[PDB]
Paper text:
pmcHuman galectins (GAL) are oligomeric β-galactosidase-binding lectins assembled from small (∼15 kDa) protomeric carbohydrate recognition domains (CRD). Among prototype galectins, galectin-7 (GAL-7) is recognized for its preferential expression profiles in normal epithelial cells. For example, while extracellular GAL-7 can trigger apoptosis of activated T cells following binding to glycoreceptors via its GBS, it can also bind E-cadherin on epithelial cells independently of its GBS. In this work, we studied the impact of homodimer interface mutations on the induction of Jurkat T cell apoptosis, allowing us to positively and negatively modulate the biological activity of GAL-7 by designing a covalent disulfide bridge (G16C) and destabilizing mutation (G16S) to control homodimer strength, stability, and biological activity.
Based on our computational predictions, mutations G16S and F135S should weaken GAL-7 homodimer interactions, while formation of a disulfide bridge in G16C could strengthen protomer interactions and favor GAL-7 homodimer stability. As predicted from our calculations and in support of our MST results, the apo G16C omit map revealed the formation of a Cys16-Cys16 disulfide bridge at the dimer interface. As hypothesized, no binding-associated MST signal was observed for G16C, lending support to stabilization by formation of a disulfide bridge between the two G16C GAL-7 protomers. As expected, the disulfide bridge between the G16C homodimers was found to be a significant contributor to dimer stability. CD melting curves show that G16C is the more stable variant (Tm = 70.0 ± 0.1 °C), followed by WT (Tm = 67.8 ± 0.2 °C) and G16S (Tm = 58.7 ± 0.2 °C). These results confirm the thermal stability advantage conferred by the G16C mutation, which provides a 2.2 °C increase in Tm relative to WT. Conversely, the G16C variant has a greater capacity to induce apoptosis of Jurkat T cells than WT, yielding an EC50 of 5.9 μM (CI95% 5.2–6.7 μM). One of the most significant structural rearrangements between WT and G16X apo structures occurs in the local environment of residues 8–17 (loop 1), which exhibit significant atomic-scale deviations in the variants. This local rearrangement of loop 1 involves Gly16 and its neighboring residues, particularly residues Pro10, Glu11, Gly12, and Arg14.
Numbering used by the authors:
A (entry chain B): 4 to 135
B (entry chain A): 1 to 135
Write the structure that this text describes.
């Protein structure tokens, strides 16, 4: 349940560096770009590695309802293995990088200038969260 | 050692491009460089010259256009040490290049040449290169 508050939002070319360890029997974890600390706040990005189902789900949340799910190729995560993730906020969308390779491109659905908070949750052991 | 390392970038880079350079500074290194150049041709213009200097304990940013070097900028201190590995991000944005070293933003180098003119990434000097990734 890590929260990084982002007053004045994030301007494009923002890099999110997420370093951590995947627990040995972890189910799934998530990184969300939300518009506020409130519960029903809109999710500009929902990045959801799911090891139980062996997938990685991208989505957004608007007006309390989830949008269409996108999925990337395979799972660049392993139970008991560390990981580094970049989330590059561009004009065209979000570039998710895992390890040394770009994993998926999630095109914008909500205005990027609405993101007010970064939340990291789930079965993840967080080492560091940096925003450049 | 992987120097001089060259990564050719036809069709350029669009903004919000992240350059990840990882390597080791050898035990008796003097200085090394990372250049965002406009072509493989000799004496090609340098949109960015990122120049860690361990012998003089400085880090110099500059650009080169039409064969002439611009004015040098300098960052705070040297986030590099002989005998220690390093990671550097060069975030090509709309306003310029954000140089991140380790866990901290180090310096912002405003554009002097059009960002869309960069055609090559070169890494040279007293550096033992681990990887150059472009996202």
């Amino acid at each position: 349940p890590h929260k990084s508050s982002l007053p004045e939002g994030i301007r494009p070319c923002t890099v999110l560096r997420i370093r951590g360890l995947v627990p040995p029997n972890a189910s799934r974890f998530h990184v969300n770009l939300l518009c506020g600390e409130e519960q029903g706040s809109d999710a500009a990005l929902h990045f959801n590695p799911r090891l139980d189902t062996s997938e990685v789900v991208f989505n957004s949340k608007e007006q309390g309802s989830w949008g269409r799910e996108e999925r990337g190729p395979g799972v660049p995560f392993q139970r008991g293995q560390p990981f580094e993730v970049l989330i590059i906020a561009s004009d065209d969308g979000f570039k998710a990088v895992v390890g040394d390779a770009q994993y998926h491109h999630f095109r914008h659905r909500l205005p990027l200038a609405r993101v007010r908070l970064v939340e990291v949750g789930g079965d993840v052991q967080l080492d560091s969260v940096r925003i450049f």
